[PDB]
């Protein structure tokens, strides 16, 4: 068995949702921000936000909504986790003591159901009579909000429309009514139903179906002055309310997909809209009052306000202030002005909240020769793309280097005092037949520049037709100075050539240090790329020189230096190249038993291969023979997102289901079958999507640092910006920390009353296993934050083992010391 320890070094930063209401007091205006597993509660002031409370939950926050049922003084909070843990929460403050109350809770998972394509949706009735949940295709789950439903029991109503896009509870209806856009073979339609708690079924809805845009994306429930709903698409915005039908199709929104909406005026007169290019629009409902005294919706107008960060969620607060919750880039407070500035913009940025964005790749490098290490990440996407320099100093100090294009891979070349960075930018087919970039970016603002003239795929007999307006990716290699982070050079790759992998190393007997890039020819017609290049560059005297190119019959998904030879993975193949005295790559040996060799890592003559669906395989280079040998494979099927080698026997992997697992050689020589079996000895639900594993540590090493119980250091980056660290334990240390977890789980009160053991259980749609071989260091590090009575309760009857003393009783002061040493690894 293997023993490991996993802690968070930086909490998730990406904004996954954000709401406003009256949660902490019936009087305050609150802003609740949800980051993965983290809830932040703020109070709105005239200058910005005053933080008041932050809690963690043992689950990914999927639904977050504020509501106030009749009889409550203030808003209550509903949250549903991605593992279908539901709960209703209350804020309660006793002087200086702030705590979060679990008013109702339960798990709403169905034994049988098909998870829907557009994900979990949760909505609440305007009269707060029920909670609607769309968890499975063809089913609508209702949690009625009766006082007695403390367990959140619910029933399913059969839903004929299997493929639902979005749904909302409508305002101004005699009964609880839902409006939803659904897809069937005839296109997309907008339809309504009524929800009967007494009959527990649907009844005919208030207005008939209307055919809507094919890419109708979002549903807006408009307040009572108007009533009805608004449907946002790619090209058109439409309003429906019984017989009334409007449609505005302004050309400006066609340029970029609209992804978020939020109401400004409680009347519903004004809404905010944001699109993927970051633009912020104002949607205006023009009223006309009739002689009846009744007001009808006269027309819809769309007005461009300015530019914000590409936002997952918007929420208007008060006055002119808007909170921009971004998943791809930094979140913001922006002020909307009535008068435009001299550039025509009505939006002016107030504050900027750091978001490490998607961490696509990263490396650890000691820029200042400190024995410490700084972490350099590829963070963000599109215009939000950036490099981040991260060092410890008690908080993390983070320098941001904007790129305005998507960074893909990073690797450090010390000989050149610079970094190599792969990047891709979006251009659009323009009337010239070529393409035009939407904005300048790093690969266009480089000091010196070059463009690949390779003739390798010059025949291109197969035609690829272009239509005006279509997007394309343009990939570049950036040379970036390590002190100034100036873009010194940009190399642009071939049209339709994607840069997938990057290394910096010396090869063979060649003393020059090169940048080597692996590429794939990507055409929209191909299921899997069938052409690619390995390109050897030399960065010398401010210019990038193309040294050699090797054609391959596939995508070079991953490369790594291997004892002076170049190890590359091309589709299913894992290949080892030698670098000849003629400065060309020469193949030595191949390995073909893979579906897609997506990830490679090495140690000595050993290679760890990460496959798309076949988990991990341990290869070995056998120098006496000049070829590869299969050592051991993990036969359990796992989709890999990143791999890493922990030591000569243990191997670490990350699953697309947000899970971490550890494999080991069975080290049993009874049968050759056992040796070839990599046994999954570690299972752990991380809750984050791991893109990159990287050996190193950010802790300052003055050499005076007490040797911690933990041995080894692997950092990892995730899509939500979370950075973590994995390390190994001795059998003795694991048992202590594990026995302590079980004690802590009995003592510590969870938000929503979610069992910790449930949360960390390995979980796919098809499997759920109890965690094993992993210590939830974030749980261990919470011992220092629990009240003294609880600490002493934890240590009662706690014994140590395999130590100087075989059995040794623990005290509350004893464990505070151990945990404080464990907090010093990050």
């Amino acid at each position: 068995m293997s023993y490991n320890y996993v802690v968070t070094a930086q909490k998730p930063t990406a904004v996954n949702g954000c709401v406003t209401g009256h949660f902490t007091s019936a009087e305050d205006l609150n802003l609740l921000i949800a980051k993965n597993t983290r809830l932040e509660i703020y109070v709105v002031t005239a200058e910005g936000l005053r933080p008041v409370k932050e809690v963690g939950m043992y689950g990914k926050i999927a639904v977050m909504e504020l509501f106030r049922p009749k009889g409550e003084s203030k808003d209550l909070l509903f949250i549903l986790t991605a593992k279908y843990n539901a709960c209703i929460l209350e804020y309660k403050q006793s002087g200086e003591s702030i705590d979060i109350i679990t008013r109702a809770h339960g798990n709403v998972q169905d034994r049988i159901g098909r998870p829907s394509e557009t994900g979990i949706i949760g909505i609440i009735d305007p009269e707060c009579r029920m909670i609607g949940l769309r968890l499975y295709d063809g089913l609508f789950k209702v949690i009625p909000l009766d006082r007695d439903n403390k367990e959140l029991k619910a029933f399913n109503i059969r839903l004929e429309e299997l493929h639902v896009i979005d749904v909302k509870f409508l305002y101004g209806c005699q009964a609880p009514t839902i409006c939803f856009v659904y897809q069937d073979p005839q296109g997309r339609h907008v339809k309504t139903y009524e929800v009967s708690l007494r009959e527990k079924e649907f009844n005919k809805g208030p207005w008939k179906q209307e055919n809507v845009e094919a890419e109708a994306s979002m549903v807006i429930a408009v307040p009572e002055p108007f009533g009805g709903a608004i449907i946002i698409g790619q090209e058109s915005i439409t309003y429906h309310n019984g017989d009334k039908y409007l449609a505005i199709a302004p050309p400006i929104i066609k340029q970029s997909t609209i992804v978020c909406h939020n109401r400004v005026d409680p009347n519903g007169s004004r809404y905010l809209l944001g699109d993927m290019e970051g633009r912020l629009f104002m949607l205006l409902l023009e009223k006309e009052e009739q002689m009846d005294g009744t007001v009808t919706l006269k027309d819809l107008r769309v007005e461009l306000l300015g530019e914000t960060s590409i936002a997952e969620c918007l929420t208007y607060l008060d006055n002119g202030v808007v909170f921009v919750g971004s998943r791809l880039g930094d979140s913001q407070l922006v002020k909307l002005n009535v008068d435009s500035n001299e550039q025509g913009s009505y939006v002016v940025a107030m504050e900027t909240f750091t978001n490490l964005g998607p961490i696509v790749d990263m490396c650890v490098v000691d820029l200042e020769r400190q024995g410490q290490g700084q972490l350099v990440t590829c963070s963000g996407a599109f215009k939000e793309g950036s490099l981040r320099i991260i060092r410890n100093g008690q908080k993390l100090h983070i320098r941001t280097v904007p790129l305005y294009e998507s960074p893909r891979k990073i690797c450090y070349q010390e000989v050149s005092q610079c970094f190599g960075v792969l990047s891709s930018r979006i251009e659009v087919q323009d009337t010239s037949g070529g393409t035009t970039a939407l904005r300048p970016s790093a690969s266009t603002q480089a000091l010196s520049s070059s463009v690949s003239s390779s003739k390798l795929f010059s025949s291109s007999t197969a035609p690829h037709e272009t239509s005006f307006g279509e997007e394309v990716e343009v990939h570049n290699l950036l040379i970036i100075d390590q002190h100034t982070f100036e873009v010194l050079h940009a190399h642009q790759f071939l049209q339709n050539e994607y840069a997938l992998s990057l290394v910096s190393c010396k090869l063979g007997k060649d003393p020059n240090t090169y940048f080597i890039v692996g590429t794939a020819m990507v055409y929209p017609e191909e299921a899997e790329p069938k052409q690619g290049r390995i390109v050897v560059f030399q960065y010398s005297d401010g210019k990038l020189q193309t040294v050699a190119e090797k054609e391959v019959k596939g995508a070079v998904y991953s490369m790594v230096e291997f004892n002076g030879k170049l190890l590359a993975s091309i589709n299913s193949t894992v290949r080892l190249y030698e670098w000849t005295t003629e400065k060309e790559l020469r193949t030595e040996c191949n390995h073909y038993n893979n579906i897609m060799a997506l990830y490679l890592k090495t140690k000595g003559d050993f290679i760890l291969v990460g496959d798309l669906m076949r988990s991990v395989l341990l290869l070995a280079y056998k120098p006496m023979e000049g070829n590869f040998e299969e050592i051991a494979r993990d036969f359990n099927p796992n989709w890999m997102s990143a791999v890493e080698i922990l030591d000569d026997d243990n191997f670490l992997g990350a699953e697309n289901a947000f899970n971490l697992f550890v494999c080991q050689k069975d080290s049993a020589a009874t049968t050759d079958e056992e040796r070839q079996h990599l046994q999954e000895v570690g299972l752990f639900h991380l809750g984050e999507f791991v893109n990159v594993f990287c050996h190193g540590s950010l802790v300052m090493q003055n050499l005076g640092e007490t040797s911690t119980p933990t041995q080894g250091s692997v950092l990892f980056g995730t899509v939500n910006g979370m950075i973590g660290l994995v390390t190994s334990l001795s059998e003795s240390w694991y048992n202590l920390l594990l026995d302590m977890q079980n004690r802590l789980n009995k003592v510590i009160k969870s938000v929503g009353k979610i069992e910790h053991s449930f949360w960390r259980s390995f979980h796919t749609e098809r499997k759920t296993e109890p965690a094993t071989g992993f210590i939830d260091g974030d749980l261990i590090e919470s011992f220092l934050d629990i009240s003294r009575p609880k600490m002493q309760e934890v240590v009662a009857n706690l014994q140590y083992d395999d130590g100087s003393g075989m059995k040794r009783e623990a005290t509350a002061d004893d464990l505070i010391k151990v945990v404080e040493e464990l907090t010093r690894i990050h």
Partner: protein, 329 residues
């Protein structure tokens, strides 16, 4: 000639790697040196000699040579290691069963879970599976171990059943005592959970029924760790075994022993209401409790769901091979 099995050497295959672990040896992917064909080699080791040649392999050799169908895995030949000796009685060299190589297995494709299965994909998949089972059942063979891992699928959409390790002949006239613990708990019929020996071919239908449901949810239907918990899950969905629906349930050894929590009513149509009508009715008949009332393979092919499916229009499931690696922002 092509029929002189057991003599040709495994030298004739370039071994690519070990695809999986089997029952009587490891399974390897290999390329024929002469023709370039991809094959799968199952290693059979008689070195243990506790009972010499494994019977599991004997069944696979005996049955798969008789069985020729598009939806059954074709055993091509049997090859051996180099004797390395002129005299027998000193040879421990193993034998290898050559099979057609299959690109993917159904469990593997599902465990990734980003595979999308439409109605037409399921029609094409199920029809082939049932046609193969019908071929095998007309020849009076019971697979007795039908699970997702045993179904094999190559990218063309061709489905092929495999791992006939537990297959045995079924006689309707002569009732024969059987092992009674053959199918994996998740795909085991209620009759076997109740210790029913002398089982009918309808055991295989139940397993294929659980698969039918699984293809519409991407999650197996009856997931349990113990034989009682499985009967409970089946009962929550299909109804509890009782003489009202299963006259011969009283004859089954464990009927008085393994009672479920309640006498549940059948909800199969309610908990599967999101399934197309033609398919749902097929499921209800396939997941019928009484094996005498459970439909046959032929009857499944004469269903509104599978009858009019066209074998020519293979309609392969869309498998992600590009843009799967980097999740779309």
């Amino acid at each position: 000639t092509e029929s002189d099995w057991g003599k040709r050497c495994v030298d004739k295959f370039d071994i690519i790697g070990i695809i999986g672990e089997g029952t009587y040896g490891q399974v390897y992917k290999a390329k024929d040196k002469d023709t370039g064909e991809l094959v799968a080699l199952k290693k059979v080791r008689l070195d243990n000699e506790k009972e010499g040649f494994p019977i599991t392999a004997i069944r696979e050799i005996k049955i798969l040579r008789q069985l020729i169908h598009r939806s059954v895995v074709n055993m091509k030949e049997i090859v051996t290691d180099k004797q390395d000796a002129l005299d027998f009685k000193k040879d421990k060299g193993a034998f290898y069963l050559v099979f057609e190589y299959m690109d993917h297995d159904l469990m593997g494709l599902l465990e990734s879970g980003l595979v999308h299965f439409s109605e037409d994909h399921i029609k094409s998949f199920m029809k082939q599976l049932m046609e193969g089972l019908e071929y095998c059942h007309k020849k009076n063979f019971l697979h007795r171990d039908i699970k997702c891992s045993n179904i094999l699928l190559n990218n063309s959409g061709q489905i092929k059943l495999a791992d006939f390790g537990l297959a045995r002949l079924y006689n309707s006239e002569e009732s024969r005592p059987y092992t009674n613990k053959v199918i994996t708990l998740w795909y085991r019929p209620p009759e076997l959970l109740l210790g029913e020996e002398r089982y009918t071919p309808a055991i295989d239908v139940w397993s294929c029924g659980c698969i039918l449901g699984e293809l519409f949810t991407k999650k197996p239907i009856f997931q349990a760790n113990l034989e009682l918990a499985q009967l409970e899950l089946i009962s929550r969905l299909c109804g509890s075994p009782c003489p009202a629906v299963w006259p011969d349930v009283i004859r089954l050894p464990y009927f008085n022993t393994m009672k479920p929590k309640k006498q549940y009513r059948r909800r199969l149509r309610e908990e599967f209401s999101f399934i197309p009508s033609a398919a749902l009715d097929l499921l209800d008949h396939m997941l019928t409790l009484d094996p005498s009332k459970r439909c046959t393979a032929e009857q499944t092919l004469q269903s509104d769901f599978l009858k009019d499916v066209e074998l020519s229009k293979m309609a392969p499931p869309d498998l992600p091979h590009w843009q799967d690696c980097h999740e779309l922002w």
